[PDB]
């Protein structure tokens, strides 16, 4: 049968790819960074405790100015915090209270949110009248929205639970490009610093690197063993890290096209919800289901510290653009800032 | 001097935002949100339609907001998603109750309903949420039992030795076979709830009273009991 021949060809191609990757791995990251001195005991403290949310916080996103941030809760609100003064700038009620994601535009002009309504709503913050109102209702996804990131004021990449990603032209409200190839619900999405590429981790234990312009999957990484919930690009853009239900963080390299290091501990058995690198990429903060966020040595895989204090499951994580602080939101409707 | 004015404006805006937030919380904490789950043939649509017709109210969610005895309610059915639910089911980890609907007259797909109930009950996040079990389509179950063409023991070998429980209500004009089948299905669903509940959450089975308002009353009573038990547990008295 033709299906058997196609499956055999796919297996042969996978074998060839694995053999090439094995031949390409002449050493390991641990075997090379063994001579560098470890980071000292990392101790962050809760500088601010942003409170005012009703239900569990599901996502957050820092601003480019590294002062304002936006968070989305499951009670149907979008609160924009002035992190320096703990004040609230905006609180946008949402048509659907089931919201899984939120984003901050690089210019700070708009915000985006989405969820079980399968719609990416975009709200204009700095309008003429000063009242935040929905500007575009991006529809076309047949699954829940899980992540959204602004390319610029007129473009946004959204990942959905219909196993497809998309690039939206906000002005026309239409899908410029569709990224298909995942066999499971896409859960995370991370833009490269150059914005020309992005990665997405789905519930099929695979992360695919996509091309924004051409709309094709350049590379696929299959080092995990469970659904991938988080993904974050390295500051260099040549690597990224992933979190998964199998209680492991894994660093993949784009040029080597294979996994470089794993960050797991015997006593850690809960899933990972959010990951984010430091400004220099030396630290890898990762939220967990055990209400704790662990700081990992991105070069030596030593757990440098722990950010304890959240009463419920940590769900979102984010490091400012200048690396000044890291903000963690969890399911007890509380946001915290650490440095 | 600009900084002082900017900070004063920020504080005033934050005060307005917090006032609106507390006004919204006063309503959010007084509203009960119920998540409707089931199968294609379970019959959630008729329940939603009856509850909307009895009390006037109300894409990817079949939202419905109504008011029953000056108590706010919110019934939503998650349609339009894919068959995989292990990720979006985590949103409803703070709902008041889960209204699980079963087709009692469909023996072929009864094990699928049992497996779905087991998965919902044993979920890590859905482990503190009580389930209101709705055993729909009782007239069809009675017709199937009385016909005799299809036997429950064909799909469930444990029905041969099953006996009607002592605490069974003898509805008027009820054949012993019909009530035996009803209570066998109810006990099959209750074993999963009692096997791992450990008092964190409860199950409230209810054979549908044909097409009557009694189902809405049962939902209201179950929600009231859940709220009472939640208050007792928060006070440390249960």
């Amino acid at each position, epitope marked *: 049968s033709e299906l058997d021949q196609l*499956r055999q060809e796919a297996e042969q191609l996978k074998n060839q790819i694995r053999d090439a990757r094995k031949a390409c791995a002449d050493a390991t990251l641990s075997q090379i960074t063994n001579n560098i001195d470890p980071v000292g005991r990392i101790q962050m403290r809760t500088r601010r405790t942003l409170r005012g949310h009703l239900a569990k916080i599901y996502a957050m996103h820092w601003g480019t100015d590294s002062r304002l941030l936006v968070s989305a809760s499951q009670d149907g609100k979008l609160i924009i915090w002035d992190s320096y003064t703990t004040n609230k700038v905006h609180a946008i009620p949402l048509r659907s209270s089931w919201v899984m994601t939120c984003a901050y535009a690089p210019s700070g002009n708009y915000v985006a949110c989405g969820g079980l309504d399968n719609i990416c709503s975009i709200y204009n913050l700095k309008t003429r009248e000063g009242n935040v109102r929905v500007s575009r209702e991006l529809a076309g996804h047949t699954g829940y929205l899980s992540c959204c990131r602004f390319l610029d004021d007129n473009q946004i990449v959204t990942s959905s639970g219909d196993t497809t990603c998309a690039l939206w032209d906000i002005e026309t409200g239409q899908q410029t490009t569709t990224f298909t190839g995942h*066999t*499971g619900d896409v859960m995370s999405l991370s833009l490269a610093p150059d914005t020309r590429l992005f990665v997405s981790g789905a*519930c*099929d*234990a*695979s992360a695919k690197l996509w091309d924004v312009r051409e709309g094709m999957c350049r590379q696929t990484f*299959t080092g995990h*063993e*469970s*659904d991938i919930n988080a993904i974050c690009f390295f500051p260099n853009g040549n690597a990224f890290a992933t979190g998964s*239900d*199998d*209680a492991t963080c894994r660093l993949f390299d784009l040029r080597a096209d294979q996994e470089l290091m794993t960050y797991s501990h015997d006593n850690i*058995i809960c*899933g990972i919800t959010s990951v984010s690198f430091s400004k220099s990429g030396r630290l890898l903060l990762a939220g967990y289901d055990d209400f704790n966020c662990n700081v990992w040595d991105a070069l030596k895989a030593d757990r440098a510290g722990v950010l304890a204090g959240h009463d419920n499951r940590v769900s979102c994580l984010g490091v400012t653009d200048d690396g000044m602080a890291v903000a963690t939101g969890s399911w007890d409707s509380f946001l915290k800032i650490w440095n | 001097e600009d900084q002082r004015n900017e900070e004063k404006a920020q504080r005033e805006a934050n005060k307005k935002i917090e006032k609106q937030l507390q006004k919204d919380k006063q309503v959010y904490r007084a509203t009960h949100r119920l998540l409707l789950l089931g199968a294609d043939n379970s019959g959630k649509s008729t329940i939603v339609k009856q509850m909307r017709i009895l009390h006037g109210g109300s894409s990817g969610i079949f939202e419905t907001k109504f008011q029953v005895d000056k108590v706010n309610f919110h019934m939503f059915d998650v349609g339009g998603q*894919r*068959d*995989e*639910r*292990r990720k979006w*089911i985590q949103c409803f980890n703070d709902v008041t109750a889960i209204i699980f609907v079963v087709d009692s007259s469909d023996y072929n797909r009864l*094990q*699928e309903a049992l*497996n779905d109930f*087991k*998965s*919902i*009950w*044993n*979920n*890590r996040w859905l482990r503190t949420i009580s389930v209101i079990l709705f055993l729909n389509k009782q007239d069809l179950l009675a017709e199937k039992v009385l016909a005799g063409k299809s036997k429950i023991e064909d*799909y*469930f*070998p*444990e029905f041969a030795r099953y006996t009607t429980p002592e605490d069974a209500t003898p509805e008027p004009g009820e054949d012993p076979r019909v009530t035996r089948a009803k209570y066998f299905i109810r006990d099959e669903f209750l074993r999963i709830s009692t096997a*791992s509940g450990d008092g964190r959450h409860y199950c409230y089975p209810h054979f549908t009273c044909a097409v009557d308002t009694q189902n809405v009353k049962f939902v209201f009573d179950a929600v009231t009991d859940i709220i009472i038990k939640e208050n007792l547990k928060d006070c440390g008295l249960f």
Partner: nanobody, 128 residues
Framework: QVQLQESGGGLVQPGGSLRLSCAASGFTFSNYKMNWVRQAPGKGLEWVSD????????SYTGSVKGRFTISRDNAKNTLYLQMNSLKPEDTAVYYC?????????????????????RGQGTQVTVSS
């Protein structure tokens, strides 16, 4: 990558016997609860059996209880399903499934039309 390969299916006369295997690779076997699923022609995917990580907890469907036996061996990373007293309606494609997350009692989306942690399946046919 997570990969499950099944074997053992084939022609079996009614009242015969069979044994299925599931060579699991790409993940630690002793951390996940395993499953067996089948798909009869013209019918949807139907759960058959499951087994705990250590093999202590085992459950089947009503139509296969007393005929099918599920077992696992964490040393060889394989899952077995011995099938006895086969009947013609058992003709189905049998898939070896895995729970999505480790250390988890409940199992979600095992019988979905598409599921990443599922094998290609082996056709089992029963006819005299």
């Amino acid at each position: 990558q997570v990969q499950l390969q099944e074997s053992g299916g084939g022609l079996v006369q009614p009242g015969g016997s069979l044994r299925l295997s599931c060579a699991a690779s790409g993940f630690t076997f002793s951390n996940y609860k395993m499953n067996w699923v089948r798909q009869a022609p013209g019918k949807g995917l139907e759960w058959v059996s499951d087994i705990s990580q250590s093999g202590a907890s085992i459950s089947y469907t009503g139509s296969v209880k007393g005929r099918f036996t599920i077992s696992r061996d964490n040393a060889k990373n394989t899952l077995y399903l011995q099938m006895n007293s086969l009947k013609p309606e058992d003709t189905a494609v049998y898939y070896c499934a895995r729970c999505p997350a480790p250390f988890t009692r409940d199992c979600f989306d095992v019988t979905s039309t598409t599921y990443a942690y599922r094998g290609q399946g082996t056709q089992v046919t029963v006819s005299s």
